[PDB]
From a paper:
Inositol-1,4,5-trisphosphate receptors (IP3Rs) are large, tetrameric cation channels that serve as the primary intracellular calcium ([name]+) release channels in nonexcitable cells. Expressed in the endoplasmic reticulum (ER), IP3Rs mediate the flow of [name]+ from the ER into the cytoplasm and other cellular compartments where [name]+ contributes to the regulation of cell division, differentiation, metabolism, migration, and cell death. Notably, IP3Rs are inhibited by micromolar cytosolic [name]+ concentrations, resulting in a biphasic dependence on [name]+ for channel activity. Here, we collect electron cryomicroscopic images of human type 3 IP3R (hIP3R3) vitrified in a broad range of [name]+ concentrations and treat particle abundance as a proxy for the relative free energy of each state to establish high-resolution thermodynamic models of IP3R activation and inhibition, which combined with cellular [name]+ imaging elucidates the structural basis for IP3R-generated [name]+ oscillations.
Residue numbers in the entry:
A (entry chain D): 2367 to 2403, 2448 to 2519
B (entry chain A): 2062 to 2074, 2111 to 2226, 2230 to 2403, 2448 to 2651
C (entry chain D): 2596 to 2651
Write the structure that this text describes.
Amino acid sequence: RSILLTALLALILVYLFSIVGFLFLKDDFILEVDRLPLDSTERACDTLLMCIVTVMNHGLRNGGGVGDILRKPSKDESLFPARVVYDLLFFFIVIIIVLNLIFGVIIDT
Amino acid sequence: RHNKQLQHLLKPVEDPLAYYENHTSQIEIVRQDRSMEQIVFPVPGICQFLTEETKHRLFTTTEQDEQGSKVSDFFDQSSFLHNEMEWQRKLRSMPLIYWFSRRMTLWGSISFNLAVFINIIIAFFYPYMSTGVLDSPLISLLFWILICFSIAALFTKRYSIRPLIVALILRSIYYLGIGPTLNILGALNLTNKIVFVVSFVGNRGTFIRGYKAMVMDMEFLYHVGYILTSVLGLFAHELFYSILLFDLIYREETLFNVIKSVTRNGRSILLTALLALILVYLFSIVGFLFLKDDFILEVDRLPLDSTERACDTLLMCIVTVMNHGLRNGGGVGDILRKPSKDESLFPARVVYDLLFFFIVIIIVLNLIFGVIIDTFADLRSEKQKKEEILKTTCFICGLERDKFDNKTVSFEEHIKLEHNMWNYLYFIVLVRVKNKTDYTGPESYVAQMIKNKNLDWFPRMRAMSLVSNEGEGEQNEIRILQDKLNSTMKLVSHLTAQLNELKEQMT
Amino acid sequence: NKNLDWFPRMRAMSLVSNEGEGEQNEIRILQDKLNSTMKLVSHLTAQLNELKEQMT
Ligand SMILES: Nc1ncnc2c1ncn2[C@@H]1O[C@H](COP(=O)(O)OP(=O)(O)OP(=O)(O)O)[C@@H](O)[C@H]1O
Ligand SMILES: [Ca+2]
Ligand SMILES: [Zn+2]
């Protein structure tokens, strides 16, 4: 039960981050795809379910969080501080805290 | 207690005996001479207006004292319980407000379910106007799984209404559509929030007094704020419904434990973060002074070189370090230009990277957030301990279930009839309400103890059922002491008689 | 009667065979005290009987 509740909390946080990205960072969700034997890049966060799936998969499977897949910004862009804050918050909240809290109980038991 | 026939005839079976048994209560008290006696009293009518929600809260909220007794807090809450019962009795006159307030739990539960369903539907079908999931086969598989779960209701175990409501909502989406379903759910949620706030106001009874206090109450502010959020979600934009999940997080105990753990160790976290910031600042200074050219970052410019110099100023170095080095397992060295063995500063780069990795990544980062995990584990352990002790220990006396192993009375009977916290509360209310002139011996003693603020009249690790069988064992050293006292008295009497005889002979 | 007290609990005959001397320490003192009390009671009763006989 504790694992399920913590997973639901992680899902809630992922949903909030996906909403924020869709509303303010739609263009930065560009992913690289190796198409089977037609551009090599596709826009992932077009709908909302796609943003949620891409976050929950890549951000959780990447040590640095969701910021390791998003387009790399430049210092001259207006939303560079917003991107920095977004990435740091995601890394500190979802990767460092919730992920460990979900599965520490298993090791302890 | 001494006649079997009377006990047989006093069993309940409009029924007089049943009515008297229902309106009669009994408790056990300790007198000033350390003797336990049973007091049987009638339940006053006012005690019938105590809410089961209040009972449940008073049960699973009390905290043990240093010794391990909840009687202090239970007694201290007696005045609040009496006031709440009086207010409920007053509210009983009003039909509409009482009718709305009776079902406060139902309103909250259905509002919770509505919020969850609305968020799920928004996530699965926003934006709308592709609706790929509407035709994808996975939705059919989920529908079949929910149908199987609903059919499994024959085994009970609850968790059956919710999948049924989910299936109903899915069918409504299929037939009417997505937008109409969302509008209906939002309207229902708004109406439910209004009803719930009305019920809360009625239960708390702040409306009878000026509305200023009602508006001042923090919980009222919370409810009105979430009502504003709900109306914003209904009218301005659908995505505003996501804010409702904060209410769910706060309501759920396990989820709120994470926030509690984070808040409890707030100062330590802030200080450790400041230490990390200091280290990042020092590393940024060193890099700017001696490794300016190695801070080259790759940028995918929007539709003009692909590389830029990051550590030109100092704030840029600090930001790039704090972001990339902390978000990269290998540290800051995974973004910097790769040096060659023939470069003069290759050893300096190696030392810089190794020091950063060993100091900031391996030590400070873990030290910042280990406290949160430790506190969460401790809170879970404490909750489990409290739940375990609440189901295997008497609230009043504190005896464990193991004692009632083979005795004629089980632990369930002991907690239901003999030691009932609610019966003790009823006795306290009866003492407080009944006139002083009509007090009996036990009632006057209890009133005096209450006035003196002494809680020794509650039973502490003692039960009449247990002592009835333990009397033989207890009366072991007492008999020896009595025999010794009798022997000493006989010796004293013999000595006095001898002295009197000697005095008479001398005279 | 569903009583399990007939099983041995932290007791063994092999151990008690050697621990008997140590165990019989307070028991002897208690027996001596009881004997002294009984002797005192008997002496008091005899004195009372003698006093009653003299008075009669
Ligand atoms: N001293 C106690 N120790 C442990 N649990 C107790 C104690 N006193 C009450 N309880 C809890 O309260 C329950 C009895 O409460 P209460 O008499 O209000 O129940 P009820 O369902 O309203 O009764 P009924 O409908 O039969 O009149 C017990 O089953 C137990 O759950
Ligand atoms: Ca009188
Ligand atoms: Zn008891």
